[PDB]
């Protein structure tokens, strides 16, 4: 879904991080009674951090302001409130990424040096040439004129692949 990401300023990049307050009803463990705060974070922490989620459709970079106090006049459950920060790239968005692993047919990028981005051969310039080297492999994709691929690449999101492990962006240099 989409709170549309505004492409803006002098970076021509579309900001994708959004702050999202949410209130949740969590299944507190028995082990964490008398201290549910540390409990809910074993519902929040590893659980969600750096791992894509569907209800908020994005990577949960981290939460801020956990307030368990959402209950106050035994006890299995509890209400709590927190603010998540979410990497929420959506189709059409204009992102930027560092060149990670390039290979004839499919260049690979790392957005913010941590999210998997890849553009298929189809989506590459076509006047860009891929030369192999002292590897045989040190292959490295140089453009028409001839500078080996820059280092940081501009590209538009064509799809975001949510699936079990690391989320993966499928982009195009049109």
């Amino acid at each position: 879904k989409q709170v549309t990401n505004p492409i803006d300023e002098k970076n021509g990049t579309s900001n994708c991080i959004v702050r999202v307050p949410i209130a949740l009803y969590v299944s507190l463990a028995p082990m964490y009674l008398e201290n549910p705060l540390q409990g809910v974070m074993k519902q929040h922490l590893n659980p969600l951090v750096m791992k894509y989620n569907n209800k908020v459709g994005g990577v949960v970079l981290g939460y801020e302001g956990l307030k368990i106090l959402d209950a106050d006049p035994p006890f299995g459950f509890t209400w709590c409130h927190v603010n998540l920060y979410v990497w929420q790239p959506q189709v059409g968005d204009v992102l930027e990424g560092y060149i990670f692993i390039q290979s004839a047919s499919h260049i690979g990028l790392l957005i913010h040096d941590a999210f998997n981005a890849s553009i298929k051969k189809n989506n590459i310039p076509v006047d860009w040439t891929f030369v192999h080297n002292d590897g045989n492999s040190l292959g490295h994709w140089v453009d028409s004129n001839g500078e080996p691929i820059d280092g940081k690449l501009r590209f538009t999101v064509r799809n975001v692949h949510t699936t079990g492990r690391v989320v993966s962006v499928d982009g195009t240099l049109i």
């Binding site: 505004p6 002098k10 970079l61």
Partner: protein, 61 residues
């Protein structure tokens, strides 16, 4: 797991500035990296975020 948790938005999502994310991460990593800890592969997740914070600290204005 078996007991799903219910999530409700209490506000509509807000885009945060590059300078906010930059301060959020500082505070979130430092908090979660602090002793009185919890590894559980959060140790690697944090390592990742540190990679993210560095990228942003380098972004323009």
């Amino acid at each position: 797991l078996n007991t799903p948790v219910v999530i409700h938005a209490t506000q509509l999502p807000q885009h945060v500035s590059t300078d906010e994310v930059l301060q959020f991460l500082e505070s979130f990593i430092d908090e979660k990296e602090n002793i009185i800890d919890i590894d559980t592969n959060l140790s690697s997740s944090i390592s990742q975020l540190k990679r993210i914070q560095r990228d942003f600290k380098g972004l323009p204005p």
